[PDB]
């Protein structure tokens, strides 16, 4: 459930990162009356031109707090003062992109494929909750332990209505190199455009943190996609793995895999990792 916190109960220790959304801190939560110190991440939101009423914020928080899955970062509490502060699970090892770049020489097929499974399970849960993420990338996956990762949201995720199949976005900055063509051209987002971004995220992992379409201007991306160019097969990937990824980047959104299928296929592979990824000195 949603805990409402007073300023007396938690403390920001240090900045972990920032962005348009605001700032995230490593923090400590000491709930009143209880006798425990809980390491947390505190996300303090940037002030908006038109701040929501507290009731609006609380309503969104309740829904957010109900997102309960092993592979999505949970909201534990909220403090509403002059700023909105969201108290969330701390992921001690940071984001997955930096983690795979810094530990590449010690990451094997088992870890990579398990991560693919976990991310797919978290995205499937989001889809079941009717949430379109809209910002899936290795940077937005966080590391609880080397064996356990969780997706999080920095503001772009959207709840779809019971009868809506798509989110139609407005203006602003978009992570072009992670987006499905239909999102780039028309600002349309669905669970299936999340699948496209999932594929790019997997490619990031399999290349140990290479930048997608390196050196290619974001403005030229939709053009090369229309020509049928995609991200290249990572050298460690077998054709079977690369084909799943390529399938995530079909032009036809409904020809892309569903996350439930991605869970199944990557679970099969994670069960015999060295068959599907070939990494020197893996064992
Ligand atoms: C804007 C954006 O995409 N980001 C991604 C990370 C950051 N947001 C974040 N970071 C969390 N934890 C964390 C972060 C860096 C470290 N390293 C330890 C190793 N050093 C060499 C460098 C510091 C360690 C832990 C974190 N934990 C939970 N959350 C969410 C749920 C609010 C986090 N967000 C800002």
Distance CA(43)–CA(139), nearest Å, equals: 16
Domain shared by 38 and 101, yes or no: no
Distance CA(214)–CA(160), nearest Å, equals: 33
Q: Of 17, 67, 74, which is best to mutate to test ligand 1, by the most ligand atoms within 8 angstroms of its C-beta?
A: 17
Element (H, E) at 90: none
Q: How far is CA 58 from CA 5, 67, 84, 179, 220, in A?
A: 12, 15, 10, 30, 41
Pairing status of strand 75-80 against strand 84-89: antiparallel
Domain shared by 9 and 43, yes or no: yes
Distance CA(37)–CA(67), nearest Å, equals: 23
Domain shared by 31 and 111, yes or no: no
User: Which atom of ligand 1 is closest in space to residue 18's alpha carbon?
Assistant: 1
Token digits for 26?
Answer: 């490593």
Distance CA(20)–CA(55), nearest Å, equals: 23
Backbone gaps in the chain, preceding residues (C–N over 2.5 A): none
Distance CA(89)–CA(103), nearest Å, equals: 23
Element (H, E) at 26: strand 22-29
Q: Are 38 and 23 spatial neighbours (Cβ–Cβ below 8 Å)? A: no
Token digits for 14?
Answer: 């240090």
Domain of 258 in residue numbering reads as 91-283
Q: Are 79 and 6 spatial neighbours (Cβ–Cβ below 8 Å)? A: yes
Distance CA(63)–CA(1), nearest Å, equals: 9
Domain boundary, last residue among 90, 109, 144: 90
Domain shared by 73 and 116, yes or no: no
DSSP 74: P
Name the 3-class secondary structure at 88: strand
Question: 73 in ligand 1 pocket by Cβ < 6 Å?
Answer: yes
Closest CA to 154 of 19, 282, 48: 19
- For the chain, the distance separating the N- and C-terminal CA atoms, rounded to the nearest angstrom, is 43
DSSP string, 242-259: HHHHHHTT-SSGGGSPPH
Distance CA(17)–CA(2), nearest Å, equals: 24
Distance of CA 38 to the CA centre of its chain: 24
Instruction: State which approach was used to obtain the coordinates.
Output: X-ray
Distance CA(199)–CA(178), nearest Å, equals: 9
Distance CA(67)–CA(153), nearest Å, equals: 11
Domain shared by 17 and 146, yes or no: no
Domain shared by 277 and 165, yes or no: yes
Residue with tokens 């050196």: 215
User: Which atom of ligand 1 is closest in space to residue 43's alpha carbon?
Assistant: 32
* Domain CATH code at residue 106: 1.10.510.10
Domain shared by 124 and 84, yes or no: no
Distance CA(274)–CA(182), nearest Å, equals: 35
User: Which atom of ligand 1 is closest in space to residue 150's alpha carbon?
Assistant: 31
Domain shared by 233 and 172, yes or no: yes
* Catalytic residue from among 59, 135, 153, 252: 135
- For residues 112-128, one letter each, b for 16 or more C-beta atoms within 10 angstroms of the residue's C-beta and e for the rest, the string is bbbbbbbbbbbbbbbbe
Domain shared by 122 and 159, yes or no: yes
Measured in Å, residue 247 CA sits from the centre of ligand 1 at 31
Distance CA(228)–CA(251), nearest Å, equals: 9
DSSP strands (E only) in 90-244: 131-132, 141-145, 148-151, 158-159, 167-168, 188-189
Domain shared by 265 and 236, yes or no: yes
Domain boundary, last residue among 30, 62, 90: 90
Name the 3-class secondary structure at 150: strand
Pairing status of strand 38-45 against strand 22-29: antiparallel
Name the 3-class secondary structure at 222: helix
DSSP 16: E
DSSP strands (E only) in 35-181: 38-45, 75-80, 84-89, 131-132, 141-145, 148-151, 158-159, 167-168
Domain boundary, last residue among 68, 90, 112: 90
Measured in Å, residue 95 CA sits from the centre of ligand 1 at 6
Specify whether 135 is catalytic: yes
Number of domains in the chain: 2
User: Which atom of ligand 1 is closest in space to residue 88's alpha carbon?
Assistant: 31
DSSP 95: B
Domain shared by 223 and 259, yes or no: yes
Residue with the nearest Cα to atom 4 of ligand 1? 17
Domain shared by 216 and 152, yes or no: yes
Name the β-bridge partners of 86: 43, 78
Burial of 268 (0-12, 13-18, 19+ CB in 10 A): middle
Pairing status of strand 22-29 against strand 10-19: antiparallel
Token digits for 242?
Answer: 């690369």
Name the resolution in angstroms: 1.8
* Residue 272 burial (CB count, 10 A): 11
* Domain CATH code at residue 66: 3.30.200.20
Measured in Å, residue 76 CA sits from the centre of ligand 1 at 17
């Amino acid at each position: 459930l949603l805990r409402i916190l007073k300023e007396t109960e938690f403390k920001k220790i240090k900045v972990l990162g920032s962005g348009a959304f605001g700032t995230v801190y490593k923090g400590l939560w000491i709930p009143e009356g209880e006798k425990v110190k809980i390491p947390v991440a505190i996300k303090e939101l940037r002030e908006a031109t038109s701040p929501k009423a507290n009731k609006e914020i609380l309503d969104e928080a309740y829904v957010m707090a109900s997102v309960d899955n092993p592979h999505v970062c949970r909201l534990l509490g909220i403090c509403l003062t002059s700023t909105v502060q969201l108290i969330m699970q701390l992921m001690p090892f940071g984001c997955l992109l930096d983690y795979v770049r810094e530990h590449k020489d010690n990451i094997g097929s088992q870890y990579l494929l398990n991560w693919c499974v976990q991310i797919a399970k978290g995205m499937n849960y989001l889809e079941d909750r009717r949430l379109v993420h809209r910002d899936l990338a290795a940077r937005n996956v966080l590391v609880k332990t080397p064996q356990h990762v969780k997706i999080t949201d920095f503001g772009r995720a959207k709840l779809l209505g019971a009868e809506e199949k798509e989110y139609h976005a407005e203006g602003g900055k978009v992570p072009i190199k992670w987006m499905a063509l239909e999102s780039i051209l028309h600002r349309i987002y669905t669970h299936q455009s999340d699948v496209w971004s999932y594929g790019v995220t997997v490619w990031e992992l399999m290349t140990f943190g290479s930048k997608p379409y390196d050196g290619i201007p974001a403005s030229e991306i939709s053009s090369i996609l229309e020509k049928g160019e995609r991200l290249p097969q990572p050298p460690i990937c077998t054709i079977d793995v690369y084909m799943i990824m390529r399938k995530c980047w079909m032009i036809d959104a409904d020809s892309r895999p569903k996350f439930r299928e991605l869970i199944i296929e990557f679970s099969k592979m994670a069960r015999d990792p060295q068959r599907y990824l070939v990494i020197q000195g893996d064992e």
